[PDB]
Amino acid sequence: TLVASVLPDLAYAELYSDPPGLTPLPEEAPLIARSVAKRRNEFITVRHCARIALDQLGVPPAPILKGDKGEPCWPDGMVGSLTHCAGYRGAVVGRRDAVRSVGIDAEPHDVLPNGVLDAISLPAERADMPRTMPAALHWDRILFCAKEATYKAWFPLTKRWLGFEDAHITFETDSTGWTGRFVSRILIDGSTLSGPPLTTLRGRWSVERGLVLTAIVLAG
Ligand SMILES: CCCNC(=N)NC(=O)Nc1c(CC)cccc1CC
Ligand SMILES: [Mg+2]
Ligand SMILES: [Mg+2]
């Protein structure tokens, strides 16, 4: 799997297409009652992945509903994160006693559209990241992925907004050249609903088969 390369009580499951025959759980059905087919398929497939991963942690097949800010609603005692892009659906779930929060993201390994980089980055990230990332790799897309994984690990614990300028992310590369680590340092107040505040979120990145994958797993 691609997501295992960015992971260190924890389970995952991913699919690269939308298999026929999959249906949503009846509780989930109204959330895509009048949605386009592309949205319906990615919604159904990634939640099947979620249930495959939750089954590994002993959780019966349950519906994954959405909160007021779109965040996924996990069964009791479980955390996780979902992501879907062109050609990828991914789910990583964890046991809340040992895993405090999870955030993942997948994007096609392409250059960002013009003007997007300025909106998702801090000036020091645009300056230092070309020097720590391998040549030809779309470091701008990877940075955006790490921003997205950061937000998905941040929000379930804080329930507050986190802008692209509210976290400074530094990157490192493994000797293998296409994987590495990153550190997301929150610049605003990281007070959580429970537990110690969020200050530093460490994660992993990987480019493989035309996809960028990032993931953050916070230990409980
Ligand atoms: C440092 C972290 C900053 N990163 C973000 N704040 N990331 C987003 O808000 N991502 C987003 C999502 C959530 C995946 C859903 C819909 C639209 C967007 C972008 C407008
Ligand atoms: Mg998506
Ligand atoms: Mg995404």
Cα–Cα distance for residue pair 50/40, rounded to 1 Å: 15
CB neighbours (10 Å) of residue 85?
15
Range of the domain at 26: 1-220
Task: Kindly state if the Cβ of 147 falls inside 6 Å of ligand 1.
Answer: yes
Task: Kindly state if the Cβ of 150 falls inside 6 Å of ligand 1.
Answer: yes
Decide: 69 and 155 in contact? Cβ < 8 Å. yes
User: Structurally, how many domains does the chain consist of?
Assistant: 1
Closest residue by Cα to atom 18, ligand 1, is: 148
- Which amino acids are annotated as binding site for CoA, given as ranges? 39, 47, 66-69, 83-84, 105, 148, 152, 162
